Design a protein around this motif. Structure first.
Motif, PDB file in Angstrom:
ATOM      1  N   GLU A 298      -8.945  22.949 -25.873  1.00  0.00           N
ATOM      2  CA  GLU A 298      -8.059  24.466 -24.814  1.00  0.00           C
ATOM      3  C   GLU A 298      -7.244  23.640 -23.175  1.00  0.00           C
ATOM      4  OE1 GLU A 298     -10.690  27.555 -24.082  1.00  0.00           O
ATOM      5  OE2 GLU A 298      -9.115  28.514 -23.625  1.00  0.00           O
ATOM      6  N   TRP A 299      -8.454  22.047 -23.102  1.00  0.00           N
ATOM      7  CA  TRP A 299      -8.515  22.106 -21.330  1.00  0.00           C
ATOM      8  C   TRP A 299      -8.013  20.710 -21.762  1.00  0.00           C
ATOM      9  CZ3 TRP A 299      -8.018  25.857 -18.660  1.00  0.00           C
ATOM     10  CH2 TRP A 299      -8.607  27.078 -18.763  1.00  0.00           C
ATOM     11  N   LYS A 300      -7.630  20.013 -22.818  1.00  0.00           N
ATOM     12  CA  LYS A 300      -7.085  18.888 -22.390  1.00  0.00           C
ATOM     13  C   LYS A 300      -5.438  19.231 -21.978  1.00  0.00           C
ATOM     14  CE  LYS A 300      -9.748  16.477 -23.106  1.00  0.00           C
ATOM     15  NZ  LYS A 300     -10.990  15.087 -23.096  1.00  0.00           N
ATOM     16  N   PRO A 301      -5.256  17.802 -21.400  1.00  0.00           N
ATOM     17  CA  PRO A 301      -3.781  17.712 -20.113  1.00  0.00           C
ATOM     18  C   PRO A 301      -3.117  17.877 -21.643  1.00  0.00           C
ATOM     19  CG  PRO A 301      -5.719  16.284 -19.694  1.00  0.00           C
ATOM     20  CD  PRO A 301      -6.160  16.858 -19.704  1.00  0.00           C
ATOM     21  N   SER A 302      -1.515  18.747 -20.751  1.00  0.00           N
ATOM     22  CA  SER A 302      -0.888  18.446 -21.712  1.00  0.00           C
ATOM     23  C   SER A 302      -0.119  16.782 -22.215  1.00  0.00           C
ATOM     24  CB  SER A 302       1.002  19.137 -21.760  1.00  0.00           C
ATOM     25  OG  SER A 302       0.206  20.134 -22.034  1.00  0.00           O
ATOM     26  N   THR A 303       0.805  16.249 -22.884  1.00  0.00           N
ATOM     27  CA  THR A 303       0.940  14.733 -22.941  1.00  0.00           C
ATOM     28  C   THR A 303       2.982  14.976 -22.986  1.00  0.00           C
ATOM     29  OG1 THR A 303      -0.479  13.878 -23.710  1.00  0.00           O
ATOM     30  CG2 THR A 303       2.023  12.253 -23.158  1.00  0.00           C
ATOM     31  N   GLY A 304       3.833  14.620 -21.785  1.00  0.00           N
ATOM     32  CA  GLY A 304       5.522  15.307 -22.080  1.00  0.00           C
ATOM     33  C   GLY A 304       6.131  13.292 -22.504  1.00  0.00           C
ATOM     34  N   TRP A 305       7.130  13.402 -22.231  1.00  0.00           N
ATOM     35  CA  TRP A 305       7.807  12.816 -22.740  1.00  0.00           C
ATOM     36  C   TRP A 305       8.731  12.084 -21.426  1.00  0.00           C
ATOM     37  CZ3 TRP A 305       6.563  16.536 -26.083  1.00  0.00           C
ATOM     38  CH2 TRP A 305       6.361  16.216 -27.768  1.00  0.00           C
ATOM     39  N   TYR A 306       9.700  11.094 -21.518  1.00  0.00           N
ATOM     40  CA  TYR A 306      10.399  10.714 -20.387  1.00  0.00           C
ATOM     41  C   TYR A 306      11.482  10.498 -20.995  1.00  0.00           C
ATOM     42  CZ  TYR A 306       6.683   7.549 -18.370  1.00  0.00           C
ATOM     43  OH  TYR A 306       4.986   7.424 -17.826  1.00  0.00           O
ATOM     44  N   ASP A 307      11.399  10.167 -22.012  1.00  0.00           N
ATOM     45  CA  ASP A 307      13.401  10.374 -23.124  1.00  0.00           C
ATOM     46  C   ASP A 307      13.977  11.248 -23.353  1.00  0.00           C
ATOM     47  OD1 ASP A 307      15.945   9.276 -23.384  1.00  0.00           O
ATOM     48  OD2 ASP A 307      15.152   7.866 -24.694  1.00  0.00           O
ATOM     49  N   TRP A 308      14.767  12.276 -22.777  1.00  0.00           N
ATOM     50  CA  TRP A 308      15.240  13.055 -23.837  1.00  0.00           C
ATOM     51  C   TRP A 308      15.177  12.876 -24.917  1.00  0.00           C
ATOM     52  CZ3 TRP A 308      19.973  14.279 -25.438  1.00  0.00           C
ATOM     53  CH2 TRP A 308      21.218  12.708 -24.869  1.00  0.00           C
ATOM     54  N   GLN A 309      16.119  12.001 -25.032  1.00  0.00           N
ATOM     55  CA  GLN A 309      16.102  11.655 -26.411  1.00  0.00           C
ATOM     56  C   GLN A 309      15.441  11.606 -27.671  1.00  0.00           C
ATOM     57  OE1 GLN A 309      19.644   7.879 -25.421  1.00  0.00           O
ATOM     58  NE2 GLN A 309      20.063   8.676 -27.156  1.00  0.00           N
ATOM     59  N   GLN A 310      13.881  11.412 -26.678  1.00  0.00           N
ATOM     60  CA  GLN A 310      12.990  11.709 -27.735  1.00  0.00           C
ATOM     61  C   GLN A 310      12.281  12.569 -28.307  1.00  0.00           C
ATOM     62  OE1 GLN A 310       9.831   8.487 -28.845  1.00  0.00           O
ATOM     63  NE2 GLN A 310      10.082   8.931 -26.557  1.00  0.00           N
ATOM     64  N   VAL A 311      12.497  13.963 -27.061  1.00  0.00           N
ATOM     65  CA  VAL A 311      12.049  15.010 -27.690  1.00  0.00           C
ATOM     66  C   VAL A 311      12.254  16.144 -28.388  1.00  0.00           C
ATOM     67  CG1 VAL A 311      12.505  14.837 -24.592  1.00  0.00           C
ATOM     68  CG2 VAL A 311      11.528  17.396 -25.690  1.00  0.00           C
ATOM     69  N   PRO A 312      11.163  16.280 -29.401  1.00  0.00           N
ATOM     70  CA  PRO A 312      11.630  17.500 -30.292  1.00  0.00           C
ATOM     71  C   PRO A 312      11.824  18.726 -29.425  1.00  0.00           C
ATOM     72  CG  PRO A 312       9.305  17.331 -30.199  1.00  0.00           C
ATOM     73  CD  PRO A 312       9.515  16.619 -28.977  1.00  0.00           C
ATOM     74  N   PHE A 313      13.003  19.529 -30.409  1.00  0.00           N
ATOM     75  CA  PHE A 313      13.305  20.886 -29.600  1.00  0.00           C
ATOM     76  C   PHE A 313      14.048  21.382 -30.931  1.00  0.00           C
ATOM     77  CE2 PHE A 313      16.941  23.977 -27.053  1.00  0.00           C
ATOM     78  CZ  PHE A 313      15.640  24.537 -26.657  1.00  0.00           C
ATOM     79  N   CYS A 314      14.127  22.738 -31.638  1.00  0.00           N
ATOM     80  CA  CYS A 314      14.141  23.981 -32.570  1.00  0.00           C
ATOM     81  C   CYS A 314      14.518  21.775 -34.348  1.00  0.00           C
ATOM     82  CB  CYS A 314      15.867  23.806 -32.942  1.00  0.00           C
ATOM     83  SG  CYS A 314      16.381  25.307 -30.751  1.00  0.00           S
ATOM     84  N   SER A 315      13.315  21.525 -34.186  1.00  0.00           N
ATOM     85  CA  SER A 315      13.479  20.919 -35.476  1.00  0.00           C
ATOM     86  C   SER A 315      13.821  19.293 -35.092  1.00  0.00           C
ATOM     87  CB  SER A 315      13.113  21.106 -36.802  1.00  0.00           C
ATOM     88  OG  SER A 315      12.129  22.367 -35.999  1.00  0.00           O
ATOM     89  N   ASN A 316      15.043  19.017 -34.067  1.00  0.00           N
ATOM     90  CA  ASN A 316      15.424  17.885 -33.855  1.00  0.00           C
ATOM     91  C   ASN A 316      15.149  17.042 -32.984  1.00  0.00           C
ATOM     92  OD1 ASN A 316      18.173  17.935 -36.510  1.00  0.00           O
ATOM     93  ND2 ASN A 316      16.784  20.154 -35.180  1.00  0.00           N
ATOM     94  N   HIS A 317      15.825  15.434 -32.815  1.00  0.00           N
ATOM     95  CA  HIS A 317      15.813  15.006 -31.692  1.00  0.00           C
ATOM     96  C   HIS A 317      16.980  15.448 -31.474  1.00  0.00           C
ATOM     97  CE1 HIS A 317      14.428  12.707 -34.751  1.00  0.00           C
ATOM     98  NE2 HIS A 317      15.132  11.693 -34.394  1.00  0.00           N
ATOM     99  N   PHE A 318      17.010  14.609 -30.270  1.00  0.00           N
ATOM    100  CA  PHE A 318      19.048  14.107 -29.688  1.00  0.00           C
ATOM    101  C   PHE A 318      19.259  12.754 -29.776  1.00  0.00           C
ATOM    102  CE2 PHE A 318      19.440  18.650 -31.231  1.00  0.00           C
ATOM    103  CZ  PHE A 318      18.824  19.665 -30.412  1.00  0.00           C
ATOM    104  N   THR A 319      20.469  12.219 -30.084  1.00  0.00           N
ATOM    105  CA  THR A 319      20.823  11.055 -29.457  1.00  0.00           C
ATOM    106  C   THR A 319      22.247  10.821 -28.961  1.00  0.00           C
ATOM    107  OG1 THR A 319      19.147   9.649 -31.156  1.00  0.00           O
ATOM    108  CG2 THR A 319      21.198   7.971 -30.277  1.00  0.00           C
TER     109      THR A 319
END
Ligand SMILES: [Zn+2]
Ligand SMILES: [Zn+2]
Length: 487
Positions: A298-319
C-alpha cells in the motif's frame, strides 16, 4: 477449443467485509473540484446529442464483436416495438425490461443506452483532442506515437501503475462524479440518460463503461499529480486545509490542460509523466480514493521507466523502427508467445479458417516486424481461400482496430494505415513491396519471444509449404494464392 488452422501451421509452438469504502471529506472535495473542471473541459466545444436508430444499425454491422443475432434483431420491427415501449417507460422514470424476448430485452437496453449516452464514444468525447489525456479511437498503430509525445515532456520517470481490480474500486463518489454528465443535457435526452445512469444504482454496457472509466481515471491521475506537486498532502485527506480549496481550483484551471497531455489513459490503463518523481510517493489521495495499486504494498513508492519504449500500455510496449528508405515507424510489440497463443484458441471449418485469417492479417498490420509472425501470417493466408472474408474477434484487449477485417490486399492497407493515414509520417511515399516493410532487429525480435535461430523453427520455415498444403487439403478445393514468395 483449438484453432486447427493456426495449430497445423505453428508446429514449434506446440511443446510450449466488502470494499471500496467511500472517500473521506478532503479527498471527496478535491475529486469533486477535479471532476467539475474535467466535465467543463470535455464540454469546451462539443455538445451532447442523442444517437439515432440508423446510427445504431450502422454500429451493429461493422466491428468489434452474439452479433450473429444482433444484425438479425435490428430489422425486426418487433424489436423496435419493445424498444418503443421501454423508452416510453424511461421517459416517466420507470424501467423494467432492463429466447427471442429475453434477448431482445438485452439488446434493446444497449440501444437505449447508446441512444442516451452514445455521444460520448461516437463524437469522441474521450479522443485525445477533446480529452487531452485520453486515446479513444486510436489503434495500436497510433498509441506508440502518443507515448513518444508524452515521454517528450520533461520531468520524472514515466509511470504506469495498474489498479488492483479497477471496476471493484469505483466508489459511490466516482459514480456521482460520472453522473454530472446529466447536467450537460436537457429535454428528453436528459430524462433518457437519467434512466440509464439510475440503472447502475440498482452495470453499463462497455459502450458507456469505457468512456466513464477513462473520465474517472483521468481525474484520479489529476489528483495524484496535484499531490505530487505539493498542492495537497497527507493533512488534507480527512479535511482540506485552510483555503486549499481555491489553491486546488486555480491549479486545475491553470495546469489541468497541460497536465492532461502528460497522460495517456485507456479505461483503467494509464501512463503518466509527472513534473518530477514526488509522484512516486503520492499515495495519500490515491489510496484514500480506494485506487490501490496492484502487486505492491500500500505505501511503497511506485517505480517508473526512463524509456517510453519500454513502458507497457494496452499490453504492448512500443518501438522505433527504421525502414529501408530511412523513415521511422513506431510499432507495437508484445510477447510472441501471447500472440500465437491467442490465435490458437477458437472461441466449424470455414469459421475457424476465417478467424485464423483475421489473426494473420492482424499480424501483417501490427506485428509485421516480428519474423515468425510475418512468416506464419503468410502461411495462414496461403492456406485459407483468398475469397474468404476474415471473421471473428482477434482483438482481445478491447481498443479499436479492425482494418485487417478485409479481403483487400494487405500491402495496400499497410500503406494506408502506416503511411497515408499516419499523421506522424511526413513523407507520404508508398511502399511497393513487403520486402521494404522492415523487421525489428534480430536481437529485439529474440527479446520479444522470437524462435528465430532455433532449430525447431528452422525446419518449420523450410518445410512450411508442406503444412500449407496439408491445410489446403483439409479445407478442400478452393482458390488459394501463394504469399510465401513475397518474404
Ligand atoms: Zn429500461
Ligand atoms: Zn517487443
Amino acid at each position: 477449443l483449438v484453432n486447427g488452422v493456426v495449430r497445423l501451421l505453428s508446429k514449434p509452438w506446440d511443446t510450449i467485509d466488502t470494499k471500496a469504502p467511500e472517500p473521506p471529506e478532503g479527498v471527496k472535495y478535491v475529486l469533486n473540484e477535479t471532476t467539475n473542471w474535467l466535465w467543463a473541459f470535455l464540454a469546451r466545444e462539443k455538445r451532447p446529442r442523442m444517437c439515432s436508430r440508423e446510427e445504431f444499425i450502422r454500429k451493429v454491422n461493422s466491428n468489434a464483436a452474439q452479433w450473429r443475432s444482433a444484425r438479425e434483431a435490428v430489422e425486426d420491427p418487433k424489436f423496435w416495438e419493445m424498444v418503443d415501449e421501454e423508452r416510453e417507460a424511461h421517459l416517466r422514470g420507470e424501467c423494467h425490461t432492463c429466447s427471442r424476448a429475453i434477448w431482445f430485452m438485452w439488446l434493446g437496453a444497449r440501444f437505449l443506452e447508446f441512444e442516451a449516452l452514445g455521444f460520448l464514444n461516437e463524437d469522441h468525447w474521450l479522443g485525445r483532442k477533446n480529452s487531452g489525456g485520453g486515446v479513444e479511437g486510436l489503434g495500436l498503430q497510433k498509441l506508440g506515437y502518443i507515448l513518444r509525445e508524452v515521454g517528450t515532456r520533461p520531468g520524472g520517470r514515466i509511470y504506469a501503475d495498474d489498479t488492483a481490480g479497477w471496476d471493484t474500486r469505483i466508489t459511490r463518489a466516482d459514480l456521482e462524479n460520472e453522473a454530472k454528465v446529466l447536467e450537460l443535457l436537457d429535454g428528453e435526452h436528459r430524462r433518457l440518460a437519467r434512466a440509464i445512469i439510475e440503472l447502475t444504482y440498482r452495470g453499463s454496457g462497455q459502450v458507456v463503461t469505457y468512456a466513464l472509466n477513462t473520465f474517472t481515471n483521468l481525474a484520479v491521475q489529476l489528483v495524484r499529480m496535484m499531490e505530487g506537486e505539493g498542492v495537497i498532502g497527507p493533512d488534507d485527506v480527512e479535511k482540506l486545509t485552510k483555503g486549499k480549496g481555491p489553491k486546488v481550483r486555480t491549479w486545475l484551471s491553470e495546469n489541468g490542460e497541460e497536465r492532461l497531455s502528460r497522460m495517456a489513459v485507456s479505461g483503467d490503463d494509464c501512463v503518466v509523466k509527472p513534473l518530477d518523481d514526488r509522484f512516486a510517493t503520492s499515495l495519500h489521495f490515491l489510496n484514500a480514493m480506494s485506487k490501490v495499486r496492484k502487486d505492491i504494498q500500500e505505501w511503497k513508492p511506485s517505480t517508473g521507466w526512463y524509456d517510453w519504449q519500454q513502458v507497457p500500455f494496452c499490453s504492448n510496449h512500443f518501438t522505433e523502427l527504421i525502414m529501408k528508405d530511412g523513415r521511422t515507424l513506431v510499432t507495437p510489440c508484445r510477447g510472441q508467445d501471447e500472440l500465437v497463443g491467442r490465435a490458437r484458441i477458437s472461441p466449424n471449418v470455414r469459421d475457424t479458417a476465417c478467424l485464423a485469417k483475421s489473426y494473420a492479417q492482424m499480424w501483417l498490420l501490427l506485428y509485421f516486424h516480428r519474423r515468425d509472425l510475418r512468416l506464419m501470417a503468410n502461411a495462414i493466408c496461403s492456406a485459407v481461400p483468398v475469397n474468404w472474408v476474415p471473421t471473428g474477434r482477434t482483438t482481445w484487449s478491447i481498443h479499436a482496430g479492425g482494418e485487417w477485417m478485409t479481403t483487400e490486399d494487405m500491402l495496400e492497407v499497410w500503406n494506408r494505415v502506416w503511411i497515408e493515414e499516419n499523421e506522424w509520417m511526413e513523407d507520404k511515399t508508398p511502399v511497393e513491396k513487403w520486402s521494404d516493410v522492415p523487421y525489428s532487429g534480430k536481437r529485439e525480435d529474440i527479446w520479444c519471444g522470437s524462435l528465430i535461430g532455433t532449430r525447431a523453427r528452422a525446419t518449420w520455415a523450410e518445410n512450411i509449404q508442406v503444412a500449407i498444403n496439408q491445410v489446403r487439403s483439409i479445407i478442400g478445393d478452393e482458390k488459394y494464392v501463394d504469399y510465401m514468395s513475397s518474404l
